[PDB]
Design a binder for this molecule. Structure first.
Ligand code: HEM
Ligand SMILES: COc1ccc(CNc2ccc(Cc3ccncc3)cc2)cc1
Ligand SMILES: [Cl-]
Length: 412
């Protein structure tokens, strides 16, 4: 059929778009007119990838199919982040293969099995009470300030405290853990142009390996002991493997949940009936509707290891496919009224945590609990908050971020 009505040369991973807006109309145009569409990229404008473009995947069923067929669609070959600075060295992309997110089976299979020790329901549930207490304190302190930056005073802290609590990081070290985590992402935004993710990753690996050594001597009931204690088959994370795990967690556990909270509250400010309902019932289905609406990871990619026909399109060996979760989470064929913010939506089969498959987010229930606890605390302590000015969006080609959002917590 006809080509999609998009500006010539439009690139759905272009950070300059996301610094201003989410390209919602553009995604909808692809879902209607070219649900799998070749996103060409000019020389030097591939965000670190120099292969001429990628297949934009905009339908949820296609995202699920790619995610399920990890034997064909590789995370390791080019990593899963679809956009870096245009001049990033290839070697700096490949160094990402040392975290489980960017590995294929069988290496991924072994690590995921080991790490599952640290994300058991029980391990995560043991954090409930401390995170609830921290959430109430966070909201109380924010409301006492009267007004300020919702991103910094409400959204930022609890995700970091969850990481710290899961890993058993001493309180006196959480400041520097928080700093390292915040130095990893956003380096294409002018506000964060001076961050040094490679240096922070090295400091965190050094910190983490020291912790692994210490926790081997004196086991504490965090996840670390489960991760570095050999099982019957001698399987365990080496000290450097634990280091790479902490790097992965410090990044994965921070800004995505933060941006879920900020954009969830933006959604409530735009939909007062849902906010009144939330305050009255406190439905935990709200967390999944918040993640669907926020889709904090706009997109992750894969690379075909062989020719593969996907919904009538011939994917060729070596080509990248980019799963636009932001499009799939508003797929009219899966969601009733996807553009209605409905905190009771149930079932809510969004792919904000990825598609079902080998790499499905291991932190999903930790994220959902963080979100439910903080919105309860917001409803308890600042039920009448009112935005003061527009949010400032993050310049990124794959993360949907809010840097700042001024709100009046007392709403007067
Ligand atoms: C709302 C918050 C979050 C969102 C939107 C999110 C999103 C995602 C997505 C899309 C994936 C899919 C990877 C893929 O298919 O290539 C994923 C995987 C993963 N997530 Fe999350 N995530 C969130 C919170 C967290 C948290 C809190 C943690 C840990 C504390 C975490 C740890 C991970 C890990 C380790 C993986 C890789 C799993 C593997 O490769 O086997 N995430 N996440
Ligand atoms: C130098 O060592 C390294 C190794 C790997 C990495 C990148 N790892 C990474 C990439 C993307 C995300 C985003 C995400 C958020 C929530 N859930 C899942 C994924 C998290 C971690 C950097 C430096
Ligand atoms: Cl609905």
């Amino acid at each position: 059929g006809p080509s999609p009505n998009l500006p010539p040369g439009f690139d759905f991973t272009d950070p300059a778009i996301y610094a201003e807006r989410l390209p919602v109309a553009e995604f909808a145009e692809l879902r209607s007119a070219a649900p799998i569409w070749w996103n060409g990229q000019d020389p030097g404008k591939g965000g670190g990838f120099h292969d001429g473009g990628f297949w934009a995947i905009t339908k949820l069923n296609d995202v699920k199919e790619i995610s399920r067929h990890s034997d064909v669609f590789s995370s390791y070959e080019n990593g899963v982040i679809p956009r870096f600075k245009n001049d990033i060295a290839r070697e700096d992309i490949e160094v990402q293969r040392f975290v489980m997110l960017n590995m294929d089976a069988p290496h991924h299979t072994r690590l995921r099995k080991i790490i599952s020790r640290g994300f058991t329901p029980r391990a995560v549930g043991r954090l409930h009470d401390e995170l609830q207490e921290r959430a109430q304190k966070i909201a109380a302190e924010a409301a006492a300030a009267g007004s300020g930056d919702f991103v910094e005073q409400v959204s930022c802290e609890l995700p970091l405290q969850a990481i710290a609590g899961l890993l058993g990081v001493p309180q006196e070290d959480r400041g520097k853990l928080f700093h390292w985590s915040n130095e990893m992402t956003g380096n294409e935004d002018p506000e964060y142009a001076h961050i040094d993710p490679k240096a922070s990753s090295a400091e965190l690996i050094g910190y983490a390996m020291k912790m692994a050594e210490e926790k081997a001597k004196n086991p504490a009931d965090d996840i670390v002991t489960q991760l570095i204690q050999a099982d019957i088959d001698g399987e365990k994370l080496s000290d450097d493997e634990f280091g790479f795990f902490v790097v992965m967690l410090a990044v994965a556990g921070n800004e995505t949940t933060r941006n879920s909270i900020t954009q969830g509250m933006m959604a409530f400010a735009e939909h007062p009936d849902q906010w009144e309902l939330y305050k009255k019932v406190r439905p935990e289905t709200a967390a999944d509707e918040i993640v669907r609406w926020a889709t904090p990871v706009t997109a992750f990619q894969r690379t075909a290891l062989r020719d593969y026909e996907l919904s009538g399109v011939q994917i060729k060996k070596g080509q990248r496919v980019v799963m636009f979760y932001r499009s799939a989470n508003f797929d009219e064929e899966v969601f009733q009224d996807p553009f209605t913010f409905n905190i009771l939506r149930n079932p809510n089969p969004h792919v904000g945590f990825g598609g079902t498959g080998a790499h499905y987010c291991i932190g999903a229930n930790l994220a959902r609990m963080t979100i439910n606890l903080i919105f309860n605390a917001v409803a308890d302590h600042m039920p009448d908050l009112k935005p003061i000015s527009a949010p400032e969006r993050l310049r990124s080609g794959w993360l949907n971020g809010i840097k700042h959002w001024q709100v009046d917590y007392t709403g007067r």
